[PDB]
Design an enzyme around this catalytic site. Structure first.
Site, PDB file in Angstrom:
ATOM      1  N   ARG A   1       0.558  -1.315  -0.385  1.00 45.65           N
ATOM      2  CA  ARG A   1       0.190  -0.259  -0.039  1.00 45.65           C
ATOM      3  C   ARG A   1       0.704   1.136  -0.191  1.00 45.65           C
ATOM      4  NH1 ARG A   1      -3.429  -0.674   4.637  1.00 45.65           N
ATOM      5  NH2 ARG A   1      -3.831  -3.240   4.997  1.00 45.65           N
TER       6      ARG A   1
ATOM      7  N   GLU B   1      -0.666  -5.013  13.278  1.00 40.79           N
ATOM      8  CA  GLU B   1      -1.844  -5.158  14.432  1.00 40.79           C
ATOM      9  C   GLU B   1      -2.589  -6.389  14.024  1.00 40.79           C
ATOM     10  OE1 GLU B   1      -4.874  -2.162  13.146  1.00 40.79           O
ATOM     11  OE2 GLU B   1      -5.497  -2.455  15.617  1.00 40.79           O
TER      12      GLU B   1
HETATM   13  O1  LIG Z   1       2.659  -2.304  10.945  1.00 46.91           O
HETATM   14  P1  LIG Z   1       1.320  -1.731  11.569  1.00 46.91           P
HETATM   15  O2  LIG Z   1       2.093  -0.461  12.056  1.00 46.91           O
HETATM   16  O3  LIG Z   1       0.874  -2.170  12.820  1.00 46.91           O
HETATM   17  O4  LIG Z   1       0.413  -1.659  10.582  1.00 46.91           O
HETATM   18  C1  LIG Z   1       0.507  -1.137   9.551  1.00 46.91           C
HETATM   19  C2  LIG Z   1       0.646  -1.956   8.032  1.00 46.91           C
HETATM   20  O5  LIG Z   1       0.049  -3.098   8.203  1.00 46.91           O
HETATM   21  C3  LIG Z   1      -0.821  -2.966   6.879  1.00 46.91           C
HETATM   22  O6  LIG Z   1      -0.519  -3.784   5.592  1.00 46.91           O
HETATM   23  C4  LIG Z   1      -0.944  -1.582   6.493  1.00 46.91           C
HETATM   24  O7  LIG Z   1      -0.639  -1.752   5.048  1.00 46.91           O
HETATM   25  C5  LIG Z   1       1.136  -1.417   6.844  1.00 46.91           C
HETATM   26  O8  LIG Z   1       2.037  -1.595   5.680  1.00 46.91           O
HETATM   27  N1  LIG Z   2      -6.966  -1.000  11.139  1.00 45.53           N
HETATM   28  C1  LIG Z   2      -6.552  -0.991   9.573  1.00 45.53           C
HETATM   29  N2  LIG Z   2      -6.806  -0.788   8.607  1.00 45.53           N
HETATM   30  C2  LIG Z   2      -5.825  -0.916   7.280  1.00 45.53           C
HETATM   31  N3  LIG Z   2      -4.782  -0.644   7.533  1.00 45.53           N
HETATM   32  C3  LIG Z   2      -3.987  -1.105   8.282  1.00 45.53           C
HETATM   33  N4  LIG Z   2      -3.047  -2.069   8.403  1.00 45.53           N
HETATM   34  C4  LIG Z   2      -2.918  -1.708   9.631  1.00 45.53           C
HETATM   35  N5  LIG Z   2      -4.338  -1.940  10.140  1.00 45.53           N
HETATM   36  C5  LIG Z   2      -4.927  -1.154   9.965  1.00 45.53           C
END
Ligand SMILES: O=P(O)(O)OC[C@H]1O[C@H](O)[C@H](O)[C@@H]1O
Ligand SMILES: Nc1ncnc2[nH]cnc12
Ligand SMILES: O=P(O)(O)OC[C@H]1O[C@H](O)[C@H](O)[C@@H]1O
Ligand SMILES: Nc1ncnc2[nH]cnc12
Ligand SMILES: [Mg+2]
Lengths: 237, 231
Positions: free
Chosen positions: B82, B120
């Site tokens: 992303r 997350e």
């Molecule tokens: O690593 P965290 O900050 O928990 O989560 C953010 C990532 O998790 C998802 O793939 C989003 O696109 C970010 O790359």
């Molecule tokens: N809550 C959330 N929504 C979208 N992308 C995420 N990546 C990690 N947490 C997220």
């Protein structure tokens, strides 16, 4: 700043041999052998050497923005493939002021989504993996362009064609930066559904001639695995 | 527009920023039943990329922030997949390389691999050796900063080349998760002075921008044949 295409196979277009933008690609596109690649095709064209060259990125952006701005009937959406198509579509879509729609591997997308048939790629046999798109992101009144970095066998593009077809939209063009024309990647899209999309041009800025012997990116010598740790890398600072 | 420091070195747009108000109208969140990940509110990036006005606002904010510097930024480093949606449009306008930080078995050549990381909701990030060096001044970019585990993997890779980390950038920061902490405690706090800048935060996710389809029956994944009957 117009760059010129030539039709090398039916509805398969690439830049002319002398095109200044092709010459820029020839100096930056590198290929890697199986020993230095994530997939053991003979010549793997790493997209990062393109994104690391802002002049070529600007040339890609300018080419497609100008091309689609000059259509008599404008496009309404650009649909790009996870993950490398994501690198190219948005910079074009923002200048055209159109949505960039994500085509994603499984289900990655939230909400109601449409799934393609299981896809294949030059280096991927069929499995359970399909491409998906958000339902409601485009519809039968849309005029769409599919964009990716490489078109090889055309299996990935076929998955996108299936998703466009699932909403009844008009497919205006298929776009990429590298077309391996010897693989005839137009064939799946152009024969799907009895030839429904045979009038769709494929436009790939450069082709397999960019992957010349002098353009190998493999290191000439390297100790051990190509994968090094942070601690190992720090010793090379 | 103007930034507010909501946590130490964690900045987001002010409440009345016109760009924040646009995000409020465009961003949608999805409950676990309608999302690929088991989190209460999943913020789908596709609703951002489908809005060219917001995409232009994101691009213009970071281009304006990073242009005409005394010491220019030399590279934008963006995360698979992303972050790839945001970095290139900024890098082209700044006339700098966009460098890919990728999941396993994605980059060719000699590559540096991070420590295993978590999100997350093992797995390591990688970068091509030679894409940037100790003289580089780099920005890391992603869409969402949640726990900060992904950003920490990027910081490890920047540190592995001795480069100067200029800023951490995103469009959505979930500040209740305090995602600055992993990066800001790495290597004894070496990077604790690097700002995180996320254009909006969790307050953009309200009751009224939930994207859950309240009437949809059955599986949220439909076949092409099923979709065509809805045309
Ligand atoms: O690593 P965290 O900050 O928990 O989560 C953010 C990532 O998790 C998802 O793939 C989003 O696109 C970010 O790359
Ligand atoms: N809550 C959330 N929504 C979208 N992308 C995420 N990546 C990690 N947490 C997220
Ligand atoms: O499907 P093919 O045309 O064989 O191969 C091209 C695709 O395979 C790789 O992921 C590229 O990035 C494209 O998405
Ligand atoms: N030869 C190739 N190089 C890079 N990406 C590809 N995707 C499919 N075939 C490829
Ligand atoms: Mg992939």
């Amino acid at each position: 700043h117009h760059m010129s295409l030539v039709e090398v196979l039916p509805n398969y277009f690439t830049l002319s041999k002398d095109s200044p933008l092709r010459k820029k690609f020839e100096k930056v596109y590198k290929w890697y052998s199986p020993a230095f690649s994530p997939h053991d095709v003979p010549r793997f064209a790493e997209v990062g050497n393109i994104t690391e060259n802002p002049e070529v990125m600007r040339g890609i952006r300018d080419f497609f923005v100008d091309r689609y701005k000059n259509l008599q009937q404008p496009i309404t959406h650009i649909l790009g493939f996870d993950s490398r198509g994501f690198l190219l579509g948005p910079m074009i879509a923002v200048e055209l002021n159109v949505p960039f729609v994500l085509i994603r591997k499984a289900n990655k997308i939230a909400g109601v989504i449409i799934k393609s048939e299981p896809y294949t790629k030059e280096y991927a046999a069929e499995s359970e993996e399909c491409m998906t798109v958000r339902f409601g992101s485009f519809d039968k009144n849309s005029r769409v362009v599919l964009i990716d970095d490489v078109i090889a066998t055309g299996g990935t593009m076929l998955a996108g064609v299936q998703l466009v077809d699932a909403c009844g939209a008009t497919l205006v063009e298929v776009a990429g930066i590298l077309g391996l024309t010897f693989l005839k990647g137009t064939q799946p899209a152009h024969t799907f559904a009895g030839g429904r999309y045979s009038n769709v041009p494929f436009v790939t800025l450069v082709d397999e001639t960019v992957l010349s012997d002098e353009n190998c990116g493999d290191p000439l010598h390297h100790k051990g695995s190509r994968i090094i740790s942070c601690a190992e890398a720090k010793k090379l600072i």
